[PDB]
Structure 1
Amino acid sequence: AAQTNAPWGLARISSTSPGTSTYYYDESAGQGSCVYVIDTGIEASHPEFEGRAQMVKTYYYSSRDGNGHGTHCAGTVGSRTYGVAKKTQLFGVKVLDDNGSGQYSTIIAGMDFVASDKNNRNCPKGVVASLSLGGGYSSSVNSAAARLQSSGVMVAVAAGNNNADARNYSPASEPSVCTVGASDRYDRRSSFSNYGSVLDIFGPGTDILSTWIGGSTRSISGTSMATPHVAGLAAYLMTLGKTTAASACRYIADTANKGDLSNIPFGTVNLLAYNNYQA
C-alpha cells in the first residue's frame, strides 16, 4: 500500500532517505494487534479512528480526553490518515489529567492495569503500550515499565524533551523498554530531544500532524510524538510476524536506518525507525 502526501514522519519511516512524501506499508497495517495509549485519554469518536479506538480505564472523573495529547499520540499509532498501523486496535488508559499532568502513583497503576487487562482482550498478533510521558528519575516508575514489558507487552516510552541525558528521567531510563528519541524532517536530532546510552531508537518527533480533540487535527512536537511512531511500527511488524513483543525493540534497532541523523552525541545510537517495506 502507498499513502500519498502522507505526514512527513510516516513517509520517513518507509524510506532510507529524508524528503519523501509517500508512506509505503504492507496492507495488513497492524490488523490483529493492540496498542494501549497510556496518556490523557483518546477521543474514540474521532472519525479518524474508524471505531477501532476505545477507552478502557480512567484514573480521573471522566474518561474524556480534555487535553488532546493522548488523542494525538493515538492518531500517530493508528489513525487512518496519520497512523503507522492503520488497522490496529487502540485502547485508551487515562493516567494524565486534562492539563497533561499525572502523579507517578497513577502512572504506575495504569501500567499494571495494562499488564492485567490484556488478558481480557483478543489481540492475536500481540500487545504494545505507548507511554508519551515522564518526569524525573524514579526507580518505582522504571520498575513498573519493566513489569509491563516482562508481562509480554512491547513498551515504548518517550526519551523526554530536556535536551539532556535520559538517564535522569523515567520511564525513559528503564533499560528493558524501548526508549525513543525525536528527529526532524531534515534528519536532525530534534532540538529538545533527550539523548544518552539508554536510547534505543529515534522516530519522527518535530512537527507531527495527527488527530486532536473536537474531531480536529494539529501538528505538535515532542518525544511524545516520536514514541507512537515506534509503538505503531512494532504493532505493524508484529502483525507481519517479523518480531514479538519481547524482541521488537531490538528488531527495530537491527533494521533501522543507521547513521542518518545529525547532532547525535557520541555514545547515543544513530538509529532511525524504518519499516524496510519491500513491495
Structure 2
Amino acid sequence: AAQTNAPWGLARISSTSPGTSTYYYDESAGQGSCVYVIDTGIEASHPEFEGRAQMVKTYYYSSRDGNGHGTHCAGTVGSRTYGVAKKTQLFGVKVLDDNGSGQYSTIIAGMDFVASDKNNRNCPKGVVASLSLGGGYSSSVNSAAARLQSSGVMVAVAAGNNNADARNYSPASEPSVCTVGASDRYDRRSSFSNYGSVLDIFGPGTDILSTWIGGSTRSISGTSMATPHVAGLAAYLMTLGKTTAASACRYIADTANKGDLSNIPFGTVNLLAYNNYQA
C-alpha cells in the first residue's frame, strides 16, 4: 500500500533515503496486534482512530486526555493518516495527569496493569507498549519495564530529551526494553535527543504531525514522538509474522538503516527504524 503526502516520519520508516513523502507498507497494517499507549490518555473519539482506540485504565478523575501528548503518540502508532500500524488496536492507560506529570508509583502500577490486562484483550498477532515518558534513574521503574517485557509485551521507551546519556534516566536505561532516540527529516540526531550505549534504535522525532485533542492535529517534537514510530513498527512486523515481542527490538535494530544518521556520538548506535517493505 502507498499513502501519498504522508508525514515525513512515516515516509522515512519505509525508505532507504530521506527526502521522500510517500509511506509504503503491507496492507495487513498491524491487524490483530494491540498497542498500549501509557501516557496522558487518548481521545478515542478522534475520527482518525476509526473506533480502534479505547481507554482501558486511568489513575485520575477522568480517562480523557486533557493534555494532547498521549493522543499525539497514539496517532503516530495507529491513526489512519498519521500512524505506522493503521489497523492495530490502541489501548490507553492514563498514568500521567493533564499537565503531563505522574508519580513513579503510578507509572509502575500502569506497567504491571498492562502485563496483566493483555490477558483480557484479543491480540493474536502480539502486544506492544509505548512509553513516551521518563525521569531520573530508578531501579524500580526499570524493573517494572523489565517485567512488562518479560511478560510478552514489546516495550518501547523514549530515550529522553536531555541531550545527555540515557543511562541516567528511567525507563530509558533498562537494558531489556527498546530505548528509542529521535532523528530529524535530514537524518540528523535531534538536538534534544538523549544518546549513549543504552539506546537501541532511532526513529523520527522532530516536527512530527499527528492527532491532537479536540479532534485536531499538530506537529511537535521529542523522543516521545520517535517512540511510537518504533512501537507501531513492532506491531506491524509482528502482524507480518517477521518477529515476536521478545525479539522485535533486536529485529528492528538488525534490519535498520545503518550508518545514515549524522551527529551520533561515538559509542551510540547509528540505526534508523526501517520496515524493509518492498512494494
**Common fold, TM-score beyond 0.5?**
yes
State how far apart, in whole Å, the 2-side matches of 1:256 and 1:52 are: 28
Shift of 1:185: 0.1
The offset of 1:191, in angstroms, is 0.2
Identity of aligned residues (%): 100
Q: Distance in 2 between matches of 1:10 and 1:229?
A: 8
Unaligned 5+ segments in structure 2 are none
Corresponding position of 2:179? 179
2: CA distance between counterparts of 1:45 and 1:208?
Answer: 21
SS state of the match for residue 262, structure 1?
A: coil
1:4-34 deviation line (CA, Å, top 9, x unaligned) = 0000000000001100000000000000000
Report how far residue 97 of structure 1 moved.
Answer: 0.2
Taking the aligned partners of 2:240 and 2:19, their CA distance within structure 1 comes to 26
How far does the alpha carbon of each residue in 1:80-116 deviate from its partner, in whole angstroms, 9 at most, with x for none? 0000000000000000000000000000000000000
CA distance in 1 between partners of 2:35 and 2:121 (Å): 11
- Which residue pairs with 1:49 in the alignment? 49
Show the counterpart of 1:100. Answer: 100
Q: Distance in 2 between matches of 1:167 and 1:203?
A: 19
Counterpart CA distance in 2 for 1:190 and 1:82 is: 20
Give secondary structure in 2 for the equivalent of 1:133.
coil
SS at match of 2:148: helix
Report the secondary structure of 1:155's partner residue: strand
**What is the CA–CA distance in structure 1 between the aligned matches of 2:14 and 2:20, rounded to whole Å?**
9
Give per-residue Cα distances to partners, 1:205-241, cap 9 Å, x unaligned. Answer: 0000000000000000000000000000000000000
Q: 2-side partners of 1:163 and 1:260: how far apart?
A: 20
CA distance in 2, matches of 1:197, 1:16: 24
**Structure 1 vs Structure 2 CA RMSD:** 0.2
Aligned residue in 2 for 1:238: 238
Deviations 1:180-205 (A, max 9, x none): 00000000000000000000000000
* SS of structure 2 residue aligned to 1:38: strand
Aligned-partner Cα distance in 2 for 1:258–1:266: 14
Structure 1 runs not aligned, ≥5 long: none
**Aligned partners of 1:61 and 1:152: how far apart in 2?**
30
SS at match of 2:203: strand
Report the Cα offset of residue 152 of structure 1. 0.1
Q: Give the whole-Å Cα distance in 1 for the aligned partners of 2:258 and 2:116.
A: 36
Q: What is the distance in 2 between the residues matched to 1:270 and 1:12?
A: 15
Count of residue pairs the alignment pairs up: 279
- In the alignment, the residues of structure 1 paired with residue 187 and residue 99 of structure 2 have an alpha-carbon distance, to the nearest angstrom, of 31
1:81 corresponds to which residue? 81
SS at match of 1:123: coil
Q: Distance in 1 between matches of 2:208 and 2:196?
A: 23
Which residues in structure 2 correspond to 1:115-134 (within 5 Å)?
115-134=115-134
Tell me the alpha carbon deviations over residues 36-92 of structure 1, each in whole angstroms, 9 at most, x when there is no partner: 000000000000000000000000000000000000000000000000000000000
Deviations 1:229-263 (A, max 9, x none): 00000000000000000000000000000001000
Corresponding residue number in structure 2 for 1:155: 155
Cα distance in structure 2, aligned partners of 1:39 and 1:260: 31
Aligned equivalents of 1:200, 1:269: Cα separation in 2:
7
2:168 and 2:55 map into 1 onto residues whose CA distance is: 31
Q: Report the Cα distance in structure 1 between the residues aligned to 2:136 and 2:223, rounded to whole angstroms.
A: 15
What SS class does the counterpart of residue 210 from structure 1 fall into? strand
Can you list the C-alpha shifts for 1:105-136, whole angstroms capped at 9, x where unaligned? 00000000000000000100000000000000
Partner SS, residue 181 of structure 1: strand
